[PDB]
Design a binder for this molecule. Structure first.
Ligand SMILES: [K+]
Ligand SMILES: [K+]
Ligand SMILES: [K+]
Ligand SMILES: [Mg+2]
Ligand SMILES: [Mg+2]
Ligand SMILES: [Mg+2]
Ligand SMILES: [Mg+2]
Ligand SMILES: [Mg+2]
Ligand SMILES: [Mg+2]
Ligand SMILES: [Mg+2]
Ligand SMILES: [Mg+2]
Lengths: 17, 343, 132, 63, 225, 51
RNA sequence: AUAUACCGCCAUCUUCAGCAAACCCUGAUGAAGGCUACAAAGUAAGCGCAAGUACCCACGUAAAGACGUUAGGUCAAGGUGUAGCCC
């Protein structure tokens, strides 16, 4: 079987000054 | 005992062994990786094995305007809640295990030819919804260090295009493959080329360049010929918008030199208007389909020259043996002119 | 290297609390104590019996308010009384909070033969000190 | 967007094409001024090379 | 419905005249010859792309043809004056410490910006991080000295082309004018010449800025009545 | 294949709109099977309907 | 049974001073690399050092001491994954 790779949901920056 | 009990986080942290020496330097097989499961997902506060109904917690506080009292489910009724809870667990597990259908690229396990979508929108109200990203190469490069030793890094080559003459490529280097796709994709829109197209479907003339040790000989073709070129070139050409063209790669088949050389030769091609302005003459197109009719595709904006170009009995232009050998029926190859799929 | 009561640095997306962001060498400099009794003062007794009560209370409240505790408990003892102070999330309905308060207060008073009072302070989301 | 290919073409050519392709929604402020009052030479990058053999500079002495 | 008239009358109208701000009366070939704008470096320092502008080499001292400078300087002053009329951000760059004070003062005098200090890598190609996402970069960079202190091209010449910023530059006989959009060939060492350049660009800018206030008042006054 | 996966696509000589997808619009040549991916049986039925 | 599945608590270099996300640039868009103050492409959140704090001060001693290294130590603190025993 092929390696299963799908685009992961983009993260949102948590730390803001 | 009850004082030797930990929490789920401590139990899963030690059971998964995600942070350990084995993970650090490719010392652990991924064939059967352990996977974290949340055992509190489908649990209701107040539901136990005895089947007790606690007013205000498990069940509504008041029924028919009166406060309920402590009640306990019957054996038959409590056994139906356990089986319905199990079905929910299996349903949840089954959906997660199922894999959504995927679209492969050049090969099943090859990253090349896979789309990464449009580049991320810019902060100052910039969007690239008309652009498309396609992976060309994903390499795993290693580097010896003093402390860690042999650490793995990813090099990614991507191309972006809007389908209307604008296209560019970039390189992304990172430790995670998903971070290399973003860098290359978002950096390729700031290094865009504009490729000129003849009638919006092909190049203006035959190109034959060499980047370092890679040789690329492209040819102009009529409508309906299709793309008969290296698979990487077919990915870029769709991004640019070139429907019909033939290309042959010789020498080194390095993807980065083939990519950097293709954009170089496709940007240095002279159009028919430039040729007319440069020589102050009419560029006339002759077609067998249209017979002897002369079609003027470009005319000089400036003063038209009254003197014709001196006819040359024989032209001292360097020829290619591969092309002369084909026109004279001498290039025998059991791999040329093979029936293939539409590109 | 030392590990005790330390949250190792991460890429930057891990949110830690004030209590969780300080190691043991700050327990009397930048942090207080989660429990306050007299057992450990000079000349006092029953330090081993107050400790077992604290270890049980933290586990009882953690499993009795599952997913609702934003931060660690602050246990207070004044004479006979025992005061449990907790910060809780607002996800759960108030009806269930009042039920668990009347159930937990009563059960722990008959188990430790003492008047037990529980003081909840709801917060929208887990207060974040910094991102390690 | 834009294009940071300083070697490829000139700012006018790179901006003229991208504006016509659609990438640039609005052309830059200077663009109109350059087309109307352009310079004598298009500012295209060129690599300096060394003269070899008998090639010499045209510079003459002022006598 | 009212913007088209405003744009056509104000912005397009100047672009229809060869010398809207009349910057050809600000200088002359004799005004440049008296400021030693024709004196270049020695032949051994000469750059190969400045040969077209070299009248000759008198005793191994390149002489810059002022006939071309006047034609090259007219296009720069007009372009510089038009960008100030459009309320563009003009940045003066120079790494010659001798004239650093003079250039900074002129920029303040003409309501423009200067950078005569060490150019930190990323001012232009990374301004979002350094200044902020909503930062506005210069619309015109004027190079009074295109070389740095180790006799190499200023990094901003290459960085201004990456950001598609038009550059104006005073190139000497040992300078590279290939990426400079409007290059003026002249001496960049003598203090009598740098005072001229500064006075000319400062005059063209102040005129253009005052020329737009006259065109707007007429439109505003005429529009009401 | 494209013709066998959809049972509502009928290779008939009256269905000119479907037969135009298997003929080049620039050279008037019927594509070979590997081009479109149809089987030999349906490519032989298209050619007869196209002729 | 396996510390060569781990958490947990540590040793060691550390009687160190560096680690590093995210960008940018160079090298023809190769692995790679990134300083010169009369300055020449680097900017940097965060962690650490530092600073604070404790003990009799500003001193000193404690404490602290990152990322990594040695599959370092410990399944016999306790817990635990896998495998095994259950008259
Ligand atoms: K360990
Ligand atoms: K153990
Ligand atoms: K075990
Ligand atoms: Mg396969
Ligand atoms: Mg130690
Ligand atoms: Mg000079
Ligand atoms: Mg070990
Ligand atoms: Mg001290
Ligand atoms: Mg110590
Ligand atoms: Mg310290
Ligand atoms: Mg070992």
């Amino acid at each position: 079987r092929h390696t299963a790779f799908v685009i992961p949901k983009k993260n949102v920056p948590t730390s803001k000054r | 005992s009850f004082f030797t009990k930990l929490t789920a986080d401590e139990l899963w942290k030690g059971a998964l062994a995600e942070t350990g020496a084995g993970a650090k330097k490719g010392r652990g097989k991924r064939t059967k990786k352990k996977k974290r499961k949340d055992l509190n997902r489908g649990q209701i506060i107040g539901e136990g094995r005895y089947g007790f109904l606690w007013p205000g917690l498990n069940v509504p506080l008041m029924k028919n305007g009166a406060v309920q009292t402590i009640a306990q489910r019957s054996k038959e009724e409590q056994e139906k809640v356990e089986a319905d809870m199990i079905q929910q667990r299996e349903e949840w597990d089954r959906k997660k295990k199922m894999k959504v259908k995927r679209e492969r690229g050049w090969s099943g396990n090859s990253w090349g030819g896979i789309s990464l979508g449009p580049p991320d929108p810019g902060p100052c109200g910039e969007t690239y919804e008309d652009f498309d990203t396609r992976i060309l190469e994903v390499r795993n490069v290693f580097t010896m260090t003093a402390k860690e030793g042999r650490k793995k890094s990813i090099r990614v080559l991507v191309a972006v295009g809007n389908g209307k003459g604008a296209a560019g490529f970039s390189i992304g280097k990172a430790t995670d493959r998903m971070d290399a796709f973003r860098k290359a994709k978002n950096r390729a829109v700031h290094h865009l080329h504009y490729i000129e197209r003849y009638e919006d479907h092909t190049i203006f003339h035959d190109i034959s360049l060499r980047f370092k040790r890679t040789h690329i000989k492209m040819k102009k073709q009529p409508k309906g010929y299709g793309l008969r070129c290296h698979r990487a070139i077919i990915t870029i050409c769709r991004l640019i918008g070139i429907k019909d063209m033939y290309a042959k790669v010789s020498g080194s088949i390095n993807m980065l030199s083939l990519t950097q050389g293709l954009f170089r030769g496709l940007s240095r091609q002279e159009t028919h208007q430039q040729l007319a302005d440069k020589k102050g003459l009419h560029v006339v197109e002759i077609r067998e389909e249209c017979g002897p009719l002369p079609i003027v595709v470009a005319s000089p904006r400036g003063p038209l020259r009254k003197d014709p170009e001196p006819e040359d009995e024989v032209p001292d232009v360097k020829l290619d043996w591969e092309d002369v050998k084909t026109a004279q029926g001498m290039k025998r190859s059991v791999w040329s002119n093979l029936k293939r799929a539409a590109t | 290297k030392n590990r005790a009561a330390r949250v190792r640095v991460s890429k930057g997306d891990k949110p830690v609390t004030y209590e969780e962001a300080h190691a043991p060498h700050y327990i009397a400099h930048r942090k207080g104590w989660l429990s306050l009794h007299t057992g450990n003062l000079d000349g006092e007794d029953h330090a081993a019996e107050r400790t077992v009560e604290d270890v049980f209370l933290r586990k009882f409240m953690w499993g009795t308010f599952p997913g609702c505790l934003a931060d660690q408990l602050v246990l207070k003892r004044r004479g006979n009384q025992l005061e449990i102070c907790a910060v809780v999330l607002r996800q759960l309905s108030p009806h269930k909070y009042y039920f668990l308060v009347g159930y937990s207060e009563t059960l722990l008073s008959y188990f430790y033969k003492c008047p037990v009072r529980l003081h909840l302070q709801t917060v929208p989301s887990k207060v974040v000190y910094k991102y390690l | 967007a834009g294009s940071r290919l300083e070697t490829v073409g000139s700012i006018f050519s790179r901006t003229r094409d991208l504006v016509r392709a659609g990438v640039l929604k609005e052309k830059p402020l200077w663009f109109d001024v350059y087309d109307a009052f352009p310079p004598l030479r298009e500012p295209v990058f060129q690599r300096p090379r060394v003269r070899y053999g008998k090639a010499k500079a045209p510079i003459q002495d002022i006598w | 419905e009212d913007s088209t008239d405003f744009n056509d009358k104000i912005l397009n109208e100047p672009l229809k005249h060869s010398d809207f701000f009349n910057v050809k009366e600000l200088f002359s070939v004799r005004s440049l010859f008296d400021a030693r704008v024709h004196l270049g470096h020695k032949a051994g320092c000469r750059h190969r792309f400045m040969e077209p502008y070299i009248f000759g080499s008198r005793l191994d001292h390149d002489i810059i043809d002022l006939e071309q400078t006047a034609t090259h300087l007219q296009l720069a002053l007009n372009f510089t004056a038009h960008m100030a009329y459009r309320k563009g951000i003009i940045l003066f760059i120079s790494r010659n410490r001798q004239f650093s004070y003079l250039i900074e003062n002129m920029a303040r005098d003409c309501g423009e910006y200067a950078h005569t200090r060490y150019f930190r890598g990323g001012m232009l190609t990374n301004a979002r991080l350094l200044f902020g996402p909503t930062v506005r970069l210069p619309d015109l960079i004027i190079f009074l000295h295109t070389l740095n202190n180790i006799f190499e091209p200023h990094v901003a010449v290459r960085d201004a082309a990456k950001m598609n910023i038009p550059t104006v530059g005073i190139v000497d006989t040992n300078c590279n004018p290939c990426l400079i959009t409007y290059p003026v060939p002249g001496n960049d060492d003598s203090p009598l010449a740098v005072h001229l350049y500064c006075r000319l660009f400062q005059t063209a800018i102040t005129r253009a800025k005052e020329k737009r206030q006259q065109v707007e008042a007429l439109y505003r006054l005429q529009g009401q009545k | 294949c494209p013709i066998c996966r959809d049972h509502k696509l009928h290779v008939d000589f009256r269905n000119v709109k479907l037969l135009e997808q298997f003929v080049c619009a620039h050279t008037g040549i019927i594509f070979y099977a590997p081009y479109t991916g149809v089987c030999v049986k349906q490519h032989k039925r298209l050619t007869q309907a196209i002729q």
